[PDB]
Amino acid sequence: GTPSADQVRYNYTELPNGEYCYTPRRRCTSADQCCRPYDTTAAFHGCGRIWPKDKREKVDRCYICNNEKTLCTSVM
């Protein structure tokens, strides 16, 4: 029932640029690049900063949270 790291997981997919996807907590340019969540029905993708650490450098990074938006990938 409760949220878990499994909810903020990701799945390996193919991108239009020829690559697969950019790992989480990695500097990206477009959300589409950021690896999508393992369960699109229980999570979403996007490029930004969901932590104070990334805010310091001010650099958009791949992130993945659950549908409940209660749990998200680690900061490190």
Short mmCIF file of C-alpha atoms in Angstrom, two decimals:
data_model
loop_
_atom_site.label_atom_id
_atom_site.label_comp_id
_atom_site.label_asym_id
_atom_site.label_seq_id
_atom_site.Cartn_x
_atom_site.Cartn_y
_atom_site.Cartn_z
CA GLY A 1 0.00 0.00 0.00
CA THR A 2 2.56 2.57 1.13
CA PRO A 3 4.97 4.14 -1.39
CA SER A 4 8.32 2.53 -2.19
CA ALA A 5 11.45 3.08 -4.28
CA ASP A 6 9.93 0.59 -6.72
CA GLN A 7 7.33 3.24 -7.57
CA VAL A 8 10.04 5.70 -8.61
CA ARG A 9 11.70 3.08 -10.80
CA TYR A 10 12.38 3.39 -14.53
CA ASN A 11 12.20 1.25 -17.67
CA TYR A 12 14.65 1.02 -20.57
CA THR A 13 12.99 2.43 -23.69
CA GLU A 14 14.07 3.49 -27.18
CA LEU A 15 14.42 7.17 -28.07
CA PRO A 16 13.99 8.93 -31.44
CA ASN A 17 17.58 10.17 -31.16
CA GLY A 18 18.79 6.60 -31.49
CA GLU A 19 19.66 6.17 -27.82
CA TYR A 20 17.63 4.49 -25.08
CA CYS A 21 17.22 6.92 -22.18
CA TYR A 22 19.13 9.07 -19.70
CA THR A 23 19.53 7.60 -16.22
CA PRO A 24 17.89 9.38 -13.25
CA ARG A 25 19.60 12.27 -11.46
CA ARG A 26 21.44 12.96 -14.72
CA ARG A 27 21.72 16.27 -16.57
CA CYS A 28 19.27 16.27 -19.47
CA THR A 29 17.86 18.74 -21.99
CA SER A 30 14.33 17.46 -22.60
CA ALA A 31 11.85 15.50 -20.47
CA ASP A 32 11.33 13.08 -23.36
CA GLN A 33 14.98 12.11 -22.89
CA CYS A 34 14.60 11.34 -19.18
CA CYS A 35 13.98 7.61 -18.75
CA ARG A 36 10.26 6.98 -18.23
CA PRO A 37 8.92 5.32 -15.06
CA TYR A 38 8.52 1.54 -14.81
CA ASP A 39 4.78 2.08 -14.38
CA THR A 40 3.40 4.97 -16.43
CA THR A 41 0.05 4.21 -14.81
CA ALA A 42 1.60 4.80 -11.38
CA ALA A 43 4.33 7.30 -12.23
CA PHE A 44 5.49 9.98 -14.68
CA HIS A 45 8.66 11.36 -16.24
CA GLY A 46 10.19 14.81 -16.65
CA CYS A 47 13.36 16.90 -16.60
CA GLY A 48 13.99 19.23 -13.68
CA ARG A 49 15.18 19.51 -10.09
CA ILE A 50 13.29 17.75 -7.30
CA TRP A 51 16.08 18.24 -4.75
CA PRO A 52 17.97 21.10 -3.05
CA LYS A 53 21.31 19.70 -4.21
CA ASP A 54 20.49 20.18 -7.90
CA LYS A 55 19.11 23.63 -7.06
CA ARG A 56 22.58 24.74 -5.95
CA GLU A 57 24.06 24.06 -9.39
CA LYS A 58 20.79 25.01 -11.09
CA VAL A 59 20.84 22.25 -13.71
CA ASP A 60 17.82 20.32 -14.99
CA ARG A 61 18.14 16.60 -14.29
CA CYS A 62 16.09 13.49 -15.04
CA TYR A 63 13.60 12.71 -12.28
CA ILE A 64 10.86 10.14 -11.67
CA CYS A 65 8.07 10.23 -9.09
CA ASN A 66 5.02 8.10 -8.29
CA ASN A 67 1.43 8.91 -9.28
CA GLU A 68 0.85 9.97 -5.67
CA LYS A 69 3.74 12.42 -6.04
CA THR A 70 4.70 11.41 -2.50
CA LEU A 71 7.91 9.53 -3.27
CA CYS A 72 10.71 10.41 -5.69
CA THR A 73 14.19 9.27 -6.71
CA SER A 74 17.09 9.86 -4.31
CA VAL A 75 19.19 13.03 -4.32
CA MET A 76 22.52 11.25 -4.78
#
